[PDB]
């Protein structure tokens, strides 16, 4: 199918109990490789790639459609409808956490639970909010992306992933980062890092599990507290004693058991 092909959709298993996993900026569905083996015996598992990922056709990247996160949330609903999924647990990594939240505002019936990994509603600081970045910091990042994309990827990947700078996870993320077309990477980076989801958090009704590494380049721990305090749904927080923004990929031994506990157990 058109939607299936465009987003590299994979469906593993049959039956009603369904988990849908959405990845973050700069990576793809492979980020879930250490989690999926522990899900497939109990759940139908759905994987997909975000439009603009290097694994997707750049001719399908509509800059107007994806000028806000709503475009990605419409894609997610389209995938669920195409697969005739009536209800899922949604696991959202990084920007996909907010994409799932947005989708759940429009179609709360399609989600029983959202499990967030490394989520943030706002990366920019103001005098009463810590997101991790001053606007000048972000301006510097965008200029680096524009100036030399390969050099930026090589420098950013070890910082974002954490741990040893020459780990396989760092190498993998460097590769998927550079797999993006540079103009798309810049545009999507700006859209995500300048986003603001804070104001819609009180309207969320689907219960949320808020998970993150205690050390995360782009998500201060106080952001998990902020999500918990301001989401209008039932929520729980668990900060993991792990390093990195893609901890399910780079630190699975400590991270996967926590994610599984929150998938398998309700608040």
Author numbering: 2 to 268
How do the authors describe this structure?
A few components involved in KAR-signaling have been identified in Arabidopsis thaliana, including an α/β hydrolase fold protein, KARRIKIN INSENSITIVE2/HYPOSENSITIVE TO LIGHT (hereafter referred to as KAI2), an F-box protein, MORE AXILLARY GROWTH2 (MAX2, also referred to as ORESARA9/PLEIOTROPIC PHOTO SIGNALING/KARRIKIN INSENSITIVE1), and SUPPRESSOR OF MAX2 1 (SMAX1)/SMAX1-LIKE2 (SMXL2). Crystallographic studies and biochemical analyses have demonstrated the role of KAI2 as a KAR receptor. The structure of KAI2 displayed a canonical compact α/β-hydrolase domain that contained an α/β ‘core’ domain and a ‘lid’ domain. A smoke-derived compound, karrikin (KAR), and an endogenous but as yet unidentified KARRIKIN INSENSITIVE2 (KAI2) ligand (KL) have been identified as chemical cues in higher plants that impact on multiple aspects of growth and development.
Identification of the molecular lesion of the ply2 mutation revealed that it is a missense allele of KAI2 that causes an amino acid substitution, Ala219Val. Comparison of KAI2 and KAI2ply2 showed that there was little structural difference (r.m.s.d., 0.2 Å) in overall structure. However, in detail, we found that the residue A219 of KAI2 was bound to aromatic residues as Y124 and F134 of the lid domain by hydrophobic interactions, while the residue V219 of KAI2ply2 was bound to extended aromatic residues as Y124, F134, F157, F194, and H246 of the lid domain. Thus, the mutation Ala219Val caused stronger hydrophobic interactions with more residues. The entrance of KAI2 presents an opened pocket and hydrophobic charge for the ligand, whereas the entrance of KAI2ply2 forms a closed pocket due to C-gamma 1 and C-gamma 2 of V219, which is a bulkier residue than alanine. Thus, the narrowed entrance gate might contribute to the reduced ligand-binding ability of KAI2ply2. Furthermore, when we performed superimposition with the KAR1-bound KAI2 model previously reported by Guo et al. (2013), the V219 was predicted to cause a steric clash with the bound KAR. The results showed that the amino acid residues of KAI2 ranging from 125–150 exhibited a higher B-factor than those of KAI2ply2, implying that this region, corresponding to the helical ‘lid’ domain, might be more rigid with lower motional amplitude in the KAI2ply2 protein. The results suggested that KAI2ply2 was more thermally stable than the wild-type KAI2 protein, presumably due to increased hydrophobic interactions and reduced flexibility. Taken together, these results suggested that the Ala219Val substitution mutation of KAI2 not only impaired ligand-binding but also reduced the conformational flexibility of the lid domain, both of which would be critical for ligand perception and downstream signaling.
